[PDB]
Structures are given as C-alpha cells and as structure tokens.
Design a protein around this nucleic acid. Structure first.
Lengths: 67, 71, 94, 110
RNA sequence: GAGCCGGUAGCGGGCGUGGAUCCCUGGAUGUCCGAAUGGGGGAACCCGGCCGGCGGGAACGCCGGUCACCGCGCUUUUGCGCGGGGGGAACCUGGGGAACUGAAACAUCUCAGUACCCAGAGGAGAGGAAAGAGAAAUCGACUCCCUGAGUAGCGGCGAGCGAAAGGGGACCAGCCUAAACCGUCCGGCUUGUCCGGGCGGGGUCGUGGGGCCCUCGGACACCGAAUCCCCAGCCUAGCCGAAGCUGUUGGGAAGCAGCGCCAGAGAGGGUGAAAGCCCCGUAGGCGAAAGGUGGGGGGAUAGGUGAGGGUACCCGAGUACCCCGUGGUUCGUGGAGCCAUGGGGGAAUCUGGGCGGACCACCGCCUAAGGCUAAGUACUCCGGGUGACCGAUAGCGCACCAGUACCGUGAGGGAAAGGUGAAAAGAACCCCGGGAGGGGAGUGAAAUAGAGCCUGAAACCGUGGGCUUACAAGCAGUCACGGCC
RNA sequence: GCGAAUGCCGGCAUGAGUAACGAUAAAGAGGGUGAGAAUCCCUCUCGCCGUAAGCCCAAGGGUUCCUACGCAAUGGUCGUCAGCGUAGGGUUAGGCGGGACCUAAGGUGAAGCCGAAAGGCGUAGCCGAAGGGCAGCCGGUUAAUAUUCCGGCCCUUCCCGC
RNA sequence: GCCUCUAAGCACAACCUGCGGGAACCCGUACCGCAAACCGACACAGGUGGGCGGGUGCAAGAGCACUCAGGCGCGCGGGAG
C-alpha cells in the first residue's frame, strides 16, 4: 500500500495526529487479539505497526520540514 | 600547575652528582653521586589600585612586575 | 511516541475472580505510573479507575542446549471499576 | 551458485544426473542455488501422524541438488545465457539466446 | 531480476515483476546508562524548578522542550553568540622516570632515556631557511634510506659505549610577525610633545627598514586549504563476457573411448570420483550513479610578494654575556667548546653581536634572546592481495551462541568443543522393555558411512580357539633338543 | 624423527570391588501407589528435640514456591521421592519498609589554599544509618501471596471550596 | 514542632481553625534463612546479628531431667557378633 504512503503524504496537522493515534489504538485492539483469530491477523499486526510507523515518519517529515 | 613562574616558566628537574677533584693539580677525580634534585625561585605582590597581589617568581619577576609598574 | 497504548490483559486463573466482579487484572507497560494506569485505563476504556495496584515479575529458567537464558520482565498491574462496568467483552471472555 | 542464478521457475535438462528427462522445476534459492525439478525424491516413510493419513508416510519428495541441470532448453537444449543490444527503450530482457532461444516470454507460458 | 518475511527449517499467517528479498547513500525518531553536564546516585536509577499539552480538574502522572562545569572573546551593560571535554590496537612529542642482568663482586659505568605513570596533537605527529655546516676564498631548510666508522672518539680508558661533515638516494616553497619611525588614530596621562591599543608603510631570507633629495615607474607568482567548479578515485550496488555433444565401466562420471571447439580470458573454486568448452558475473575486457573524499590540470577568484643612489641615526625580543649547580653531546669529570637552564651578577641596534680554533692577536661564518606550513621515513584498528606459513594438542589461546564457561575480593586468569552423507533420503511399521535400548523392514553403493555417526589406529577391558601348568625358584631370556598343533 | 627432562596434554590401568556412605536422636508393623519401591504416600506402635533440632525480624541467596506431568543426569546405590526435568501459574501497601525529609563518622566538593603533571588539601552546600523523624489494627479470605486482598472498626498528608 | 520577628507581602486574600468535595506517585512482599536454600569448591558434626523462651521439679534461674506446643528419627540397609 505505498498508496497508503500517498494518503500519508496527504494528511498533516491534528489530522495525521488523530489519525495515527486512533490507528495505533486499533493495533492495541490487535494486541488483545493475541489469543483469538490470530491466523489471518498476523499481517494486521506486523503491517499495522509498519503503517503507523509510516504516519510517524511523516509527521516528522511534515513539521520538521516546517520548522 | 601551581608554581611555574608567571613572568614565564621556571618550575623543574635535575640529576646531581659529586666526587672529590685533584684533577689538574694531581690525579683523577672521584665520582659517586647518582643523586636527584629540586632547584627553584620565589613569590610577592603590589597593587592594581587598592586590591592586587602578584604570585610570580624571582628575577623575570622583579623586572617584570616593574613592567606592570609602567602599566 | 505518545501512543497511549500500554497494555496486554491478565488472563491468569485467579486474575479471573476480579473480572467476575470488580477488579480486572492486566499487564501493563513495565513502568506505567499508577496515575499513568488511571489515564490509560480510564481514557481508552471509558471506565471508573478505582484502586490500581501494581507488581512486576521478571522471568527465569529456559534452556537452549549448550547455553541458556531466562525471559524478560512481565509487568503486572490490576485496577478496579466503580459500578461493574466496562471490559465486558473481555471478561465474559477470560 | 551465489546470489546469482540460472533458470527460474523455468524448465530444463539433466546432463550428468539421474533423470535427464528435464521439465518444470519447483523452486530455486538465490545463494544456495538449490532447486527442485519435480523429478525424483522419496517418501520418508513419515511420522506416522494424522498429519498424513492418520496411518501414514511422506509423499512428494524433491529437493533438487546437483548443478548439472543443463539450464534453458529453447528449440535448443544445452545452452548458455546471453544479454542485450537493447534494440528497444531500456532493454534488459537478458532473455536467453543460444541457437534456439527462449526468454521466458511473459506469454503462452510463464 | 523476478523471489522473500534474518542464524530456524516447524507451526500458524503472508508480499511482490502496476522494478518484491537484498545491495549502497542519504533519511527519521532513535528506551536507559556512559564524557553526562539540570540535581542527586552503590552507572544502565530516584529527584526537581519554566512554556506546552492531556486527564478525574487542583494535588498527580507521562511525552515534549528545557535548565551542569569549563576557559574561551564579544553588547565591561542584563551579558546573548562561539570552543573543550570522552574516546581509540600500534605510531608520535614533551613531562617523570626503575631494578634486575653486565662489568664472572660492586659502588662511577652498563642495561637507558629502555619498562612503567602522565599530558597532549594527529592521522601522523617530529623537525623545518642558518648567531648553520666548513676550512677549498665552499656549501647552503627540515625529514627519511644507504654510507660515512664501528672509525673520530667517550671510559674503575675496564664492560662497554660509540658521532658528524661530505658522497649516494627520496623529497624539494617559501612566507611571516614587536620590531616607534611614519603617520592614522581613538584611549589616555594631564595636555602640548609618555604610554596604551587598533590600520597601515615597515610589516628585515640569506639583511637591512625607515625618514629627506633626484633615477623610479605604466600587465604574468601562486600558496601552507587562499578559494571555487570541474573530469570529481573510491565508497556498495555492474555487466557482458569464447568452445563440445555421443559413448562408456559406473550409486557417481567432468574420468577410458569417438569425434567437434574456445582463446590478448589453461588464475581458482563450485558441479555426487581428477572439465579451458558443466557451474564462476575471473583474469578478456569493458563497467558503471545525482550523494562522500583532491594529489593532477585547468582556469578564475591573485592575500601577497616583485626596482636606484644619498644622507648625522632612530628601528625582533625580558637574559645575551659572565660565575656556581646540572641536562644535552660519541664528553662519565674532565686543557673540554657549543646548545639547554636553577641559582647571583647583569650589554649591546648591522664598527651591533655569538659562531670555528680553553684561550689571545688574526681570518673566515652567521646573523639568534617571537611566529607558519606542505612533501619524502612512522604505525597498524580497519579493507585487498600474496606465502620451499599452520592444519585442527602449530596456528591469534579464539574455525564458531572462548574472553565465555569456571577460579578469584579485586586487580586479575583464562579452557575446551571442528567433519554422518551425494543429497536427509537420518529412520514409518512389526517385535522384548517402565525406559532406554536391542532384533526385524525400508536407507543404500556403505551404515563395522548410522546421528558427536569419516579416517576412528596405542593403553587398557572383554567372548572364543591352539599350545602350556600345581616339588616350583627366573626381570629376563634366549642356545639345544624333544612332546604338541 | 626423541623411553626417557618428579616434563606438557589426554586418555588409561592401580591397590580394589578393600577404605568410607559425613555425627550412637532407634526403629518396627500394617494398607496405598508404581514397572520396581528398607529407601515414596496414609495409618498404627517407639525414640530424639523443646529452651532447641523453638516459631519471627533481618542478612545474604535469588530462584524457587505452588500445580501437573517426568528421571535416563543429580541426591554419596536406592526411588516410581526432590530443594532434580518441562510447562503453566504465583508476592499488589495514603496509613509496613526504603526514597520522595534530618544529621554523624566520612565522602564529595561552588570558594580558598597548596604538586612536574596524575594531585593533595577543603568552607559552604549535597550524599551519607532499624541514629533522628513519620499517618492502623484485627478477623476472614487462594495452589500460592496478604497490618497490601475482603470485611469490620481508626487515622494521615496535600489540593478546591465554602 | 512550638513559637519570633525580616523579604515582605500579608492584610483583603497570608497563617489557625471547621465541614464538604477532591487527590496522594517510585522501588519492595513468593519461600530458605540459626540453615542441606546464607559464609566453607559438597544435602560439609566450623560460623553467622536482635526477639518469651510452655510446663513440672530443684533455694535462685534460658544449668539441669521429662516433657508444651511445633520440630525431627540425620539418607545406604540385613547380618552375625
């Protein structure tokens, strides 16, 4: 989903902020999932981490670029 | 470093000997001094304008502080 | 960095009773202040953080043939509700 | 036989080997060239686990070792591997050219 | 270029030629400790003051940004704006600085200015245009290699120690700065006319600079990075890249046999047993990128150098020089010079002043008591290549979860352990046992290649067989003969 | 190129199946479990402790503690038992303790004095202790922890308000 | 901690005192632990800091003897002698 890469690029302020916050939370969800479905979940976890990692890398890009 | 000189450096070294001559008057000397030593100067002061001192060492000292006597 | 997330629920046996009527036992970020716990718990869960207790426990004996190791640090903490609300799903569960 | 390989999924021959009857090959590693010709293995008489019929044994065996499989078999079997004169915009296509030829052409087959 | 989610294969889930795994250059936070520096503290943990936020708000508690010490110069006001420090295997410079041992004792001496403690620069530091060398009216920075001699010589002249100039070679540039005198000057003192500190001219190379009078006189020289842009070298990723097939004993064939071939690349390794032509991106060769580094060649930026006589002298050092205590020197007490300083005396401005010849008259030499830098020898952490170098008790002790297991209070010490096979095909299942483990079947070319399982030989311990033995004295044996087999 | 250096490294024999099995506080019987139990589990006889072989605080040690399975290595043989193997589960405190405070010896050290350098010394300030100071105790409750959990009764400090 | 004044605010929003509302974090606790779990290279008869020490008997009492509780019977047995 380098496409997600794009959406990332797109957002920015309290935007990217709240977006990453929520998503991270979703990953919490995952963590709890640690003992349920799990099977197709694997990705959701590794990746999800990765993706929020993206969000982050971005905020750095964005506001650091700013100041 | 807490006593080189101030009006330059005079803080150190030296190995010192001794024997008992008779060279150019009779025979060989006599030597048996593998000894080691100190060897140094001294300290003092005056005033910028009520408030001063110095520190310093001996000679380079004396004419030096004089130098600051000029200003 | 500032991801509020700081837990993995306690599903141990005795841990249960509490899920049954008031105190829910969880595993928390090793170091998550008690007020920290009130924050995470209360905020993420829409709960009534009353008495949050905390304990840590490192691991031990796990052998790998020619050499061995002993696991990291499992951090325990337990917080109780107020009326009996929240964590529902979780509790019916474990 | 290093980060660099020969035939890919592809299909080819067995020179000094124990089959020669080359064909479709399972997979190829990258450094440990190791590749599978889907042409000769065993059974391992298996675990005896319901992994296989509760009463069981192992089936498809084919870890294709030796590197005496004579890569690529265009309308010509035993051949080496070429390169490009580009001829077209950014033309790698190190496709295989030796007497007969074959490049894996994305069409009619792999 | 088409496979991969690390050494782990296994489970349970996946991603990618609408350049996935990975290779490099740059990214981003990057927990806590550690020079640690906001405070404290048995480091890898507990405390705090300010603006920010969120939450149940205040009390509380996180993320954030923050806030040691230092000397450094600046707005000397209220002080904001730079630097260091902590490292680093061997290498380097300076500080300080040792016994053994030798002298077949051992005190001058030798080991040595060595080992060791230290501070400090680096990437190299070291040294570096001459008060030099040297006696022919002669050389001309420094450094390093050979030579110069192991002579000149130093010395209980005992053990020993032990130059230099010149020759050969590598490498080759020189520039500065107070130096009152100028003036500018601003600050001063107190004012006219000293000193202070900024800009010059001067800004001493082999000596003059300057000030006053006339010859002046109108374009090539770049550093010690001047400095800037370049082909920028590599850093890691690159890629092509010559010619063989049949047969054939064979578990194997790359071998024995038939023919065909490559080649400015018969360097090696890998391919089931020994291929130039099967694999290798190698020598054959070419290859390569916008990032990180310049010796070159080139430019430009070129700071800054670059003329002539004359004329009363003003113009690089506080210490030269002398005497006593010592270091350096091939100099150990000395006829002993020079250089370097601890101590007391205590000058000179180019007729100045030391240097050669203790010293004296001469001649000859150089111009000190400030400053800066290339290059040629150093060293090995780290990369690459190579060996009448090692093969697992030698190699680094370290061939692989060895600086750790383990001894020690600590400083500190410091092991062992490598190999099944061609590839897992490594052991279904039947049989005794609680188990191991033992017998079968399949492995298979072998399993007396079976899982520390290649080769696995000596000591030692076992089962079986032949001979031999209970009136025998002898480490041993071994010469003869005879019974046995 | 080595018997041979009380040599080095490693194996390996040797008294030798002898010496001992770590305290003269004693065991013996009966069922139970196992594949096998003098040597494990209950039960019944007996002895040894008790002012210790007591129970508790701390120190140090840190896994183990429990629960299930399990022994071939380990307990000086035994073992089906373990403080042994695998796994899983297990100590929570506004009022206990320590720090969110205090000071000693002493250490550090902004100043200051002082060493060839590495430093020595050192006010104040700080570190520094079951020495000071400080707000609960009792009954119940698990395999396991509890003045922490639960309940009962009694307080503590600091914040907002009134 | 009680008080006692400066800074200085306080003094109109400081301290003493009520009641109500509200907050109060960090590290510890399992078990051994006079010891086969700590200090001796060992399930070593050595050592190791405070705490009534239950009863009875004896002039006295943590000496003594039996015992209270609660703790054991030592980790190789049998066997003659």
């Amino acid at each position: 989903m380098r496409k997600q890469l794009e959406e990332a690029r797109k957002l920015s302020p309290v935007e990217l902020e709240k977006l990453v916050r929520e998503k991270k939370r979703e990953l919490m969800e995952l963590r709890f999932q640690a003992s349920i479905g799990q099977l197709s979940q694997n990705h959701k976890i590794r990746d999800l981490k990765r993706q929020i990692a993206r969000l982050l890398t971005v905020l750095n890009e964005k506001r650091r670029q700013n100041a | 470093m807490k006593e080189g000189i101030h009006p330059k450096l005079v803080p150190a070294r030296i190995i010192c000997g001794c024997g008992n001559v008779i060279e150019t008057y009779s025979t060989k000397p006599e030597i048996y001094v593998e000894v080691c030593s100190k060897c140094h100067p001294f300290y003092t002061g005056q005033q910028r304008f009520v408030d001063t001192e110095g520190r310093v060492e001996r000679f380079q000292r004396r004419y030096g502080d004089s130098y600051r006597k000029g200003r | 960095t500032a991801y509020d997330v700081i837990l993995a629920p306690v599903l141990s046996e005795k841990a249960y009773a509490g899920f049954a009527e008031g105190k829910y036992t969880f595993w928390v970020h090793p170091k998550a202040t008690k007020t920290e716990i009130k924050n995470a718990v209360e905020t993420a869960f829409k709960v009534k953080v009353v008495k949050v207790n905390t304990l840590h426990v490192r691991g031990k004996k796990k052998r790998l043939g020619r050499y061995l190791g002993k696991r990291p640090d499992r951090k325990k903490a337990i917080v109780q509700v107020a009326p009996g609300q929240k964590i529902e799903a979780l509790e019916g569960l474990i | 036989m290093r980060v660099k390989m020969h035939v890919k999924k592809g299909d080819t021959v067995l020179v000094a080997s124990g089959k020669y009857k080359g064909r479709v090959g399972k997979v190829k590693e990258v450094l440990p060239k190791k590749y599978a010709v889907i042409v000769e293995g065993v059974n391992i008489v298996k675990k005896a686990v319901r992994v296989s019929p509760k009463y069981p044994q192992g089936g498809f065996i084919e870890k294709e070792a030796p590197l005496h499989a004579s890569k690529v078999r265009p309308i010509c079997p035993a051949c080496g591997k070429p390169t490009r004169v580009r001829k077209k915009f950014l033309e790698n296509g190190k496709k295989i050219r030796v007497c007969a030829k074959c490049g894996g052409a994305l069409d009619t087959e792999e």
